[PDB]
Enzyme design. Structure first.
Site, mmCIF file in Angstrom:
data_model
loop_
_atom_site.group_PDB
_atom_site.id
_atom_site.type_symbol
_atom_site.label_atom_id
_atom_site.label_comp_id
_atom_site.label_asym_id
_atom_site.label_seq_id
_atom_site.Cartn_x
_atom_site.Cartn_y
_atom_site.Cartn_z
ATOM 1 N N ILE A 1 1.850 8.968 -4.238
ATOM 2 C CA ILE A 1 1.031 10.189 -4.388
ATOM 3 C C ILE A 1 -0.138 10.123 -3.406
ATOM 4 N N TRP B 1 0.817 -1.211 0.000
ATOM 5 C CA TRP B 1 0.000 0.000 0.000
ATOM 6 C C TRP B 1 0.860 1.275 0.000
ATOM 7 N N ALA C 1 -8.890 11.630 -5.268
ATOM 8 C CA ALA C 1 -9.637 10.653 -6.029
ATOM 9 C C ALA C 1 -8.867 10.109 -7.247
ATOM 10 N N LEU D 1 1.664 3.817 12.969
ATOM 11 C CA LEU D 1 2.146 3.472 14.307
ATOM 12 C C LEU D 1 3.627 3.157 14.257
ATOM 13 N N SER D 2 4.346 3.557 15.295
ATOM 14 C CA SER D 2 5.770 3.293 15.391
ATOM 15 C C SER D 2 6.112 2.174 16.361
ATOM 16 N N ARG E 1 -4.895 -2.397 -7.377
ATOM 17 C CA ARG E 1 -5.160 -3.236 -6.203
ATOM 18 C C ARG E 1 -6.530 -3.915 -6.201
HETATM 19 C C1 LIG Z 1 0.594 -6.879 -9.236
HETATM 20 C C2 LIG Z 1 1.710 -6.003 -8.738
HETATM 21 C C3 LIG Z 1 2.997 -6.528 -8.601
HETATM 22 C C4 LIG Z 1 4.034 -5.732 -8.148
HETATM 23 N N1 LIG Z 1 5.293 -6.240 -8.035
HETATM 24 C C5 LIG Z 1 6.293 -5.459 -7.584
HETATM 25 C C6 LIG Z 1 7.654 -5.970 -7.418
HETATM 26 O O1 LIG Z 1 7.909 -7.169 -7.699
HETATM 27 N N2 LIG Z 1 8.589 -5.134 -6.936
HETATM 28 C C7 LIG Z 1 8.330 -3.847 -6.628
HETATM 29 O O2 LIG Z 1 9.254 -3.134 -6.174
HETATM 30 N N3 LIG Z 1 7.096 -3.299 -6.752
HETATM 31 C C8 LIG Z 1 6.069 -4.053 -7.190
HETATM 32 N N4 LIG Z 1 4.790 -3.509 -7.289
HETATM 33 C C9 LIG Z 1 4.566 -2.103 -6.908
HETATM 34 C C10 LIG Z 1 4.541 -1.201 -8.140
HETATM 35 O O3 LIG Z 1 5.805 -1.250 -8.818
HETATM 36 C C11 LIG Z 1 4.184 0.245 -7.751
HETATM 37 O O4 LIG Z 1 5.115 0.710 -6.780
HETATM 38 C C12 LIG Z 1 2.778 0.370 -7.162
HETATM 39 O O5 LIG Z 1 1.874 -0.432 -7.945
HETATM 40 C C13 LIG Z 1 2.290 1.816 -7.090
HETATM 41 O O6 LIG Z 1 2.015 2.272 -8.415
HETATM 42 P P1 LIG Z 1 2.301 3.780 -8.908
HETATM 43 O O7 LIG Z 1 3.774 4.033 -9.063
HETATM 44 O O8 LIG Z 1 1.421 3.937 -10.132
HETATM 45 O O9 LIG Z 1 1.642 4.573 -7.657
HETATM 46 P P2 LIG Z 1 2.104 6.003 -7.088
HETATM 47 O O10 LIG Z 1 3.514 5.885 -6.550
HETATM 48 O O11 LIG Z 1 1.023 6.494 -6.170
HETATM 49 O O12 LIG Z 1 2.199 6.916 -8.401
HETATM 50 C C14 LIG Z 1 0.990 7.397 -8.967
HETATM 51 C C15 LIG Z 1 1.329 7.868 -10.357
HETATM 52 O O13 LIG Z 1 2.207 9.001 -10.248
HETATM 53 C C16 LIG Z 1 3.250 8.832 -11.194
HETATM 54 N N5 LIG Z 1 4.512 8.873 -10.456
HETATM 55 C C17 LIG Z 1 4.669 9.027 -9.122
HETATM 56 N N6 LIG Z 1 5.975 9.136 -8.844
HETATM 57 C C18 LIG Z 1 6.627 9.060 -10.016
HETATM 58 C C19 LIG Z 1 8.013 9.127 -10.454
HETATM 59 N N7 LIG Z 1 8.947 9.268 -9.525
HETATM 60 N N8 LIG Z 1 8.305 9.011 -11.762
HETATM 61 C C20 LIG Z 1 7.339 8.852 -12.679
HETATM 62 N N9 LIG Z 1 6.054 8.791 -12.348
HETATM 63 C C21 LIG Z 1 5.668 8.907 -11.069
HETATM 64 C C22 LIG Z 1 2.941 7.643 -12.068
HETATM 65 O O14 LIG Z 1 2.155 8.158 -13.161
HETATM 66 C C23 LIG Z 1 2.087 6.820 -11.153
HETATM 67 O O15 LIG Z 1 1.228 5.962 -11.889
HETATM 68 C C24 LIG Z 1 3.745 -4.313 -7.776
HETATM 69 C C25 LIG Z 1 2.446 -3.800 -7.897
HETATM 70 C C26 LIG Z 1 1.421 -4.595 -8.363
HETATM 71 C C27 LIG Z 1 0.034 -4.016 -8.478
HETATM 72 C C1 LIG Z 2 -5.248 18.484 -24.579
HETATM 73 C C2 LIG Z 2 -5.015 19.050 -23.205
HETATM 74 C C3 LIG Z 2 -5.852 20.057 -22.718
HETATM 75 C C4 LIG Z 2 -5.651 20.584 -21.455
HETATM 76 N N1 LIG Z 2 -6.481 21.551 -20.973
HETATM 77 C C5 LIG Z 2 -6.270 22.064 -19.746
HETATM 78 C C6 LIG Z 2 -7.117 23.124 -19.198
HETATM 79 O O1 LIG Z 2 -8.070 23.579 -19.884
HETATM 80 N N2 LIG Z 2 -6.824 23.602 -17.978
HETATM 81 C C7 LIG Z 2 -5.805 23.127 -17.233
HETATM 82 O O2 LIG Z 2 -5.591 23.632 -16.107
HETATM 83 N N3 LIG Z 2 -4.975 22.148 -17.668
HETATM 84 C C8 LIG Z 2 -5.148 21.618 -18.894
HETATM 85 N N4 LIG Z 2 -4.280 20.635 -19.364
HETATM 86 C C9 LIG Z 2 -3.167 20.180 -18.512
HETATM 87 C C10 LIG Z 2 -3.520 18.873 -17.805
HETATM 88 O O3 LIG Z 2 -4.650 19.065 -16.942
HETATM 89 C C11 LIG Z 2 -2.312 18.336 -17.015
HETATM 90 O O4 LIG Z 2 -1.879 19.331 -16.094
HETATM 91 C C12 LIG Z 2 -1.131 17.971 -17.915
HETATM 92 O O5 LIG Z 2 -1.627 17.276 -19.074
HETATM 93 C C13 LIG Z 2 -0.073 17.135 -17.197
HETATM 94 O O6 LIG Z 2 -0.598 15.824 -16.981
HETATM 95 P P1 LIG Z 2 -0.286 14.955 -15.658
HETATM 96 O O7 LIG Z 2 -1.007 15.506 -14.461
HETATM 97 O O8 LIG Z 2 -0.591 13.531 -16.079
HETATM 98 O O9 LIG Z 2 1.319 15.174 -15.598
HETATM 99 P P2 LIG Z 2 2.224 15.206 -14.271
HETATM 100 O O10 LIG Z 2 1.813 16.391 -13.424
HETATM 101 O O11 LIG Z 2 3.659 15.092 -14.699
HETATM 102 O O12 LIG Z 2 1.760 13.899 -13.469
HETATM 103 C C14 LIG Z 2 2.241 12.639 -13.912
HETATM 104 C C15 LIG Z 2 1.369 11.598 -13.262
HETATM 105 O O13 LIG Z 2 1.593 11.643 -11.843
HETATM 106 C C16 LIG Z 2 0.329 11.575 -11.203
HETATM 107 N N5 LIG Z 2 0.213 12.759 -10.352
HETATM 108 C C17 LIG Z 2 1.124 13.748 -10.206
HETATM 109 N N6 LIG Z 2 0.707 14.589 -9.251
HETATM 110 C C18 LIG Z 2 -0.464 14.111 -8.798
HETATM 111 C C19 LIG Z 2 -1.431 14.491 -7.779
HETATM 112 N N7 LIG Z 2 -1.198 15.598 -7.090
HETATM 113 N N8 LIG Z 2 -2.532 13.742 -7.594
HETATM 114 C C20 LIG Z 2 -2.751 12.635 -8.319
HETATM 115 N N9 LIG Z 2 -1.905 12.226 -9.258
HETATM 116 C C21 LIG Z 2 -0.774 12.906 -9.506
HETATM 117 C C22 LIG Z 2 -0.735 11.296 -12.234
HETATM 118 O O14 LIG Z 2 -0.810 9.860 -12.336
HETATM 119 C C23 LIG Z 2 -0.110 11.874 -13.467
HETATM 120 O O15 LIG Z 2 -0.627 11.262 -14.638
HETATM 121 C C24 LIG Z 2 -4.504 20.082 -20.638
HETATM 122 C C25 LIG Z 2 -3.657 19.086 -21.143
HETATM 123 C C26 LIG Z 2 -3.872 18.555 -22.396
HETATM 124 C C27 LIG Z 2 -2.941 17.489 -22.913
HETATM 125 O O1 LIG Z 3 1.751 -7.122 -5.332
HETATM 126 C C1 LIG Z 3 2.789 -6.500 -5.033
HETATM 127 C C2 LIG Z 3 4.125 -7.027 -5.052
HETATM 128 C C3 LIG Z 3 5.151 -6.261 -4.637
HETATM 129 N N1 LIG Z 3 4.964 -4.957 -4.204
HETATM 130 C C4 LIG Z 3 6.051 -4.141 -3.629
HETATM 131 C C5 LIG Z 3 5.912 -3.931 -2.120
HETATM 132 C C6 LIG Z 3 7.333 -4.073 -1.607
HETATM 133 O O2 LIG Z 3 8.002 -2.811 -1.608
HETATM 134 C C7 LIG Z 3 7.966 -5.031 -2.615
HETATM 135 C C8 LIG Z 3 7.922 -6.494 -2.248
HETATM 136 O O3 LIG Z 3 6.544 -6.866 -1.953
HETATM 137 S S1 LIG Z 3 6.047 -8.349 -1.644
HETATM 138 O O4 LIG Z 3 6.177 -8.963 -3.029
HETATM 139 O O5 LIG Z 3 4.679 -8.251 -1.299
HETATM 140 O O6 LIG Z 3 7.026 -8.925 -0.855
HETATM 141 O O7 LIG Z 3 7.275 -4.814 -3.859
HETATM 142 C C9 LIG Z 3 3.717 -4.370 -4.214
HETATM 143 O O8 LIG Z 3 3.528 -3.204 -3.896
HETATM 144 N N2 LIG Z 3 2.694 -5.192 -4.604
#
Ligand SMILES: Cc1cc2nc3c(=O)[nH]c(=O)nc-3n(C[C@H](O)[C@H](O)[C@H](O)COP(=O)(O)OP(=O)(O)OC[C@H]3O[C@@H](n4cnc5c(N)ncnc54)[C@H](O)[C@@H]3O)c2cc1C
Ligand SMILES: Cc1cc2nc3c(=O)[nH]c(=O)nc-3n(C[C@H](O)[C@H](O)[C@H](O)COP(=O)(O)OP(=O)(O)OC[C@H]3O[C@@H](n4cnc5c(N)ncnc54)[C@H](O)[C@@H]3O)c2cc1C
Ligand SMILES: O=c1ccn([C@H]2C[C@H](O)[C@@H](COS(=O)(=O)O)O2)c(=O)[nH]1
Ligand SMILES: Cc1cc2nc3c(=O)[nH]c(=O)nc-3n(C[C@H](O)[C@H](O)[C@H](O)COP(=O)(O)OP(=O)(O)OC[C@H]3O[C@@H](n4cnc5c(N)ncnc54)[C@H](O)[C@@H]3O)c2cc1C
Ligand SMILES: Cc1cc2nc3c(=O)[nH]c(=O)nc-3n(C[C@H](O)[C@H](O)[C@H](O)COP(=O)(O)OP(=O)(O)OC[C@H]3O[C@@H](n4cnc5c(N)ncnc54)[C@H](O)[C@@H]3O)c2cc1C
Ligand SMILES: Cc1cc2nc3c(=O)[nH]c(=O)nc-3n(C[C@H](O)[C@H](O)[C@H](O)CO)c2cc1C
Ligand SMILES: Cc1cc2nc3c(=O)[nH]c(=O)nc-3n(C[C@H](O)[C@H](O)[C@H](O)CO)c2cc1C
Ligand SMILES: Cc1cc2nc3c(=O)[nH]c(=O)nc-3n(C[C@H](O)[C@H](O)[C@H](O)CO)c2cc1C
Ligand SMILES: Cc1cc2nc3c(=O)[nH]c(=O)nc-3n(C[C@H](O)[C@H](O)[C@H](O)CO)c2cc1C
Ligand SMILES: O=c1ccn([C@H]2C[C@H](O)[C@@H](COS(=O)(=O)O)O2)c(=O)[nH]1
Ligand SMILES: O=c1ccn([C@H]2C[C@H](O)[C@@H](COS(=O)(=O)O)O2)c(=O)[nH]1
Ligand SMILES: O=c1ccn([C@H]2C[C@H](O)[C@@H](COS(=O)(=O)O)O2)c(=O)[nH]1
Lengths: 216, 216, 216, 216
Positions: C79, C74, C162, C85-86, C172
């Site tokens: 993001i 989790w 959201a 708890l510690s 998940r």
């Molecule tokens: C089925 C399954 C298996 C998995 N197996 C493994 C495993 O073997 N090992 C492992 O380490 N993890 C594993 N994970 C964890 C996985 O790699 C992600 O850490 C986790 O699913 C959270 O996804 P997220 O990065 O989209 O979420 P968030 O960290 O909440 O990110 C939300 C979104 O923000 C963007 N974002 C946030 N930070 C960055 C960044 N620094 N650069 C670019 N984009 C960013 C991406 O668009 C991302 O989708 C697994 C997860 C799943 C569901």
């Molecule tokens: C065709 C078009 C029209 C648009 N029109 C408008 C408009 O009218 N007004 C306007 O304000 N903007 C507009 N945008 C900008 C748009 O809303 C996004 O700010 C921009 O496309 C960057 O996307 P992102 O948030 O995925 O990128 P990033 O900010 O780089 O985020 C990367 C990924 O990280 C995750 N992430 C990062 N921060 C957060 C967070 N705080 N919460 C949840 N997830 C997060 C998401 O998974 C996201 O996809 C437009 C963009 C496009 C392409």
């Molecule tokens: O389903 C999965 C598998 C792995 N992981 C991440 C969590 C932890 O940082 C590492 C190892 O997770 S474990 O595979 O559940 O042991 O990978 C996930 O976040 N989800």
């Protein structure tokens, strides 16, 4: 709603939580019961020792009207959410920030402050008339708008947690920040203080890095 | 270095890693030894099943020169690092994006495309002359600059990992994005493909959401 | 409050906004007036065309009780905001996740499911008794706790918008995720649906990538 | 490669940039030419006045082997990228952190330090034997692993920029952090200093908030 500059504003749209939200998150508390002395001391402890993650559980949404040059500074704050008016999809309004003559206090200018004011008005008027002529000739809005100056007003919703908000106040409620954004940051601070008085006072006392909020 | 628009550019300044960086991170590998078939299949598996975190271990730094209206769209990409020229601390150069007559293809305009071009040049010239007159009268640069239009060129360094870069390509290398930023995104894609061919091809095949990179 | 596994739970502590919060942010609306047909269609348009930033203006705080092995998955969701708890600063409670015999359905095991259950109970009991003996001998808690197994229960507050919540549900609330976290994600989905019905239905119809929420 | 604890390590896998990467980003420089006095002073100015975004253009990838209880603290650093071994998809190795008798210096314990050491070894041995018995009976690995203690070793790749790395050093290279992660942070600091000597020294002098790196 607080008026800023000549035509700007900051308005609180919504808020989640209050000082107690941080205390409850810090303790991972089942209690949803206020004990000022105890809760306030925990807030101060967290703030003075750099443990600021609990303040992320307090969240604000603001509606802001500001000139683009201010918005471009503001939008550099990445740990927050923004949605802004589009000049691609709608016609932008005739509204510009014109500095008051007072804005130049302390600056000896070789033309009078009032003449600076009117020269700014004149060029924005010409630029907007060109924008309109282009729009009215069938040039797409997304292209026509590129002639508009940076003092054009825009509006956005800003959702930000109290920790990132405090970072924003450190950087923007400070003399090194541009005066125009300082004015916005003072309004943000005022709303923050209203909703989170214990956190705000602890912030000022222990963590605030700027040089204006302790003086107003 | 790739030229964009009339005076813009994209240039790769530095890169960390390549396709193998993602494979090694995905496996948490001790090996620093290439096996195309195996490594390429792992890249495709990750891409097709949405497991994109391993691509975050590939990082680029670009130097970009673009008009402010393009930069303001670009800077909405929060998962990246930016540093940009300041119009508070230095004089901004006389350089503006002037659309070519071709930019209006498909748009019937009631004035000729060439006249649109010159009307844009005329207003930017007047605005810059006002900026200069204000600067030269002792108005601080941070205030004088507010009369400059959004087609003014700016420059920035952009550091971004391959996952956020792919998000940028989904949104900006796409017909819904403004044409001007599309042109930048095509250049970004070209550099990405050069440095990370296996990731790029897997991206196009399995994860790319836009509608231009499969057509060029 | 929803019970999960044998001793876990998910509880909503606070929420900011609702479906209309996203609509208002998307429009940068001054209106604080509901028009289902219009607002619902805008939500669907945003969701189906990938414009998800407006959903970031809806924010939840949950209190979660889950085993550490679930929490470690989790907490990979960056993001969002967490406080947990510690085991450095307090004694950890004797509470462990013991799978039910049903957990092994579909798996032929060479010992009976009930015996698997009791072998897990036995080892956690021995490990906790060792933890306690170490604590009671004056070993610091931060060291004593390292002998405790990953099925130990922990608790945390989780604040998430959201958009990130929908990402969490994609990953998940899906068969590829570990069954135990799936159960938590179903509870999160149920609360999300209660508070944001239009967004949730649009999500399911247009953007949800997993394979369980369309089947329950 | 630096050995940590009894069986752990930190190893640098890759790096992008050096001190000059921050200077070049701060200036948005076309120059790819070192001028120690000038570049070093700019680094100090940025560091002392809180302008740390330029340091985000320096990026590291590390391979870390550490016990899970250390990894869970480390993985709280959200502004970074992680990939870790999976106990869902592979068998976990028999490798545990056993504190040395020296770990209890300053603590009067009612049993001898050597007996604490052996009691920890004994319980981890029993837990691993149970894990293996469950695996060997056909219990899925993702379930069997839940009986393993928090001192089990894991490995991960960590990609992090110099700004987030400095935050990590403020919090973890500090006496308030758990001793075990302090040891890792000292190794991270040593590598950072090797690759970025000007930034590191400026950090120590102007921005470092902890209490160990100025003493070693
Ligand atoms: C089925 C399954 C298996 C998995 N197996 C493994 C495993 O073997 N090992 C492992 O380490 N993890 C594993 N994970 C964890 C996985 O790699 C992600 O850490 C986790 O699913 C959270 O996804 P997220 O990065 O989209 O979420 P968030 O960290 O909440 O990110 C939300 C979104 O923000 C963007 N974002 C946030 N930070 C960055 C960044 N620094 N650069 C670019 N984009 C960013 C991406 O668009 C991302 O989708 C697994 C997860 C799943 C569901
Ligand atoms: C065709 C078009 C029209 C648009 N029109 C408008 C408009 O009218 N007004 C306007 O304000 N903007 C507009 N945008 C900008 C748009 O809303 C996004 O700010 C921009 O496309 C960057 O996307 P992102 O948030 O995925 O990128 P990033 O900010 O780089 O985020 C990367 C990924 O990280 C995750 N992430 C990062 N921060 C957060 C967070 N705080 N919460 C949840 N997830 C997060 C998401 O998974 C996201 O996809 C437009 C963009 C496009 C392409
Ligand atoms: O389903 C999965 C598998 C792995 N992981 C991440 C969590 C932890 O940082 C590492 C190892 O997770 S474990 O595979 O559940 O042991 O990978 C996930 O976040 N989800
Ligand atoms: C007086 C002043 C002058 C300025 N001059 C310039 C200039 O000339 N050019 C220019 O381009 N900008 C300039 N800026 C903008 C500045 O560089 C920052 O973009 C802005 O102040 C936002 O700060 P932040 O990064 O702390 O905020 P946020 O982006 O909201 O980040 C909040 C915190 O999250 C962390 N964080 C977020 N993302 C990352 C990441 N990717 N890596 C590491 N840590 C991260 C940091 O701890 C950061 O403090 C100036 C700002 C000020 C106040
Ligand atoms: C001595 C000590 C004791 C601790 N005790 C506990 C405990 O009892 N319980 C517990 O749960 N944790 C505990 N932690 C972990 C701590 O709360 C942080 O999670 C951890 O120190 C990482 O710090 P960070 O948030 O600055 O790092 P990162 O997550 O890497 O963030 C880097 C910077 O980006 C910014 N940032 C990133 N995301 C956000 C966001 N969503 N909102 C605002 N700003 C953001 C902040 O400026 C932050 O400083 C402890 C840590 C230490 C050092
Ligand atoms: C983010 C965070 C950091 C903490 N850091 C410490 C710490 O360094 N030392 C400590 O004794 N307690 C710490 N605590 C626990 C607790 O807040 C504190 O010990 C007492 O409540 C102070 O009255 C922390 C709690 C949180 C949520
Ligand atoms: C982010 C990430 C996600 C993964 N997800 C899965 C998964 O859903 N199922 C699986 O069997 N293996 C998974 N693996 C392990 C591994 O990549 C895969 O099983 C095989 O290597 C495919 O050949 C994952 C690895 C990583 C780094
Ligand atoms: C994040 C975001 C993205 C948008 N993208 C588009 C778009 O690609 N095309 C468009 O015509 N309008 C777009 N709009 C404007 C508006 O939502 C839409 O045109 C109509 O309201 C649909 O009824 C967008 C608005 C927001 C907030
Ligand atoms: C993030 C960042 C912040 C800056 N802040 C300031 C500032 O507050 N005042 C200033 O005069 N110059 C600032 N500069 C410009 C420049 O670094 C500085 O004026 C001189 O180079 C110092 O020798 C900044 C540059 C950057 C990249
Ligand atoms: O005070 C400042 C100075 C600069 N900046 C950022 C905003 C923009 O992306 C770039 C140039 O800003 S300007 O100096 O106000 O032109 O740097 C800020 O965010 N604040
Ligand atoms: O294509 C688009 C449209 C809008 N935006 C963002 C940028 C800026 O913060 C705001 C207004 O942009 S504008 O539509 O190009 O004026 O929305 C984008 O990022 N891309
Ligand atoms: O020193 C500390 C104490 C706690 N934490 C975080 C890690 C984990 O998510 C939670 C409990 O950590 S524990 O105190 O080491 O059990 O809080 C840390 O990250 N560092």
């Amino acid at each position: 709603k607080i008026d800023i500059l000549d035509k700007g504003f900051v308005e609180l749209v919504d808020v989640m939580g209050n000082d107690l939200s941080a205390v409850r998150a810090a303790r991972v508390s089942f209690d949803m019961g206020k004990d000022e002395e105890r809760d306030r001391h925990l807030i101060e402890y967290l703030m003075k020792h750099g443990h600021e993650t609990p303040f992320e559980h307090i969240v604000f949404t603001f509606h802001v009207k500001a000139p683009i040059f201010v918005a471009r500074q503001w939008f550099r704050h990445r740990i927050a959410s923004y949605n802004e008016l589009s000049g691609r999809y709608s016609k932008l309004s005739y509204e510009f920030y014109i500095p008051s003559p007072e804005r130049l206090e302390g600056y000896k200018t070789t033309i009078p402050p009032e003449r600076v004011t009117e020269k700014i008005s004149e060029i924005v008027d010409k630029a907007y008339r060109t924008y309109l002529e282009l729009i009215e000739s069938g040039v797409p809005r997304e292209v026509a708008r590129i002639v508009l100056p940076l003092n054009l007003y825009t509006r956005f919703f800003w959702t930000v947690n109290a920790r990132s908000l405090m970072n924003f106040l450190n950087l923007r409620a400070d003399s090194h920040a541009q005066w125009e954004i300082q004015q916005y940051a003072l309004a943000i601070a005022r709303i923050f203080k209203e909703k989170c008085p214990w956190t705000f006072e602890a912030f000022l006392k222990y963590a605030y890095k700027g040089d204006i909020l302790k003086e107003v």
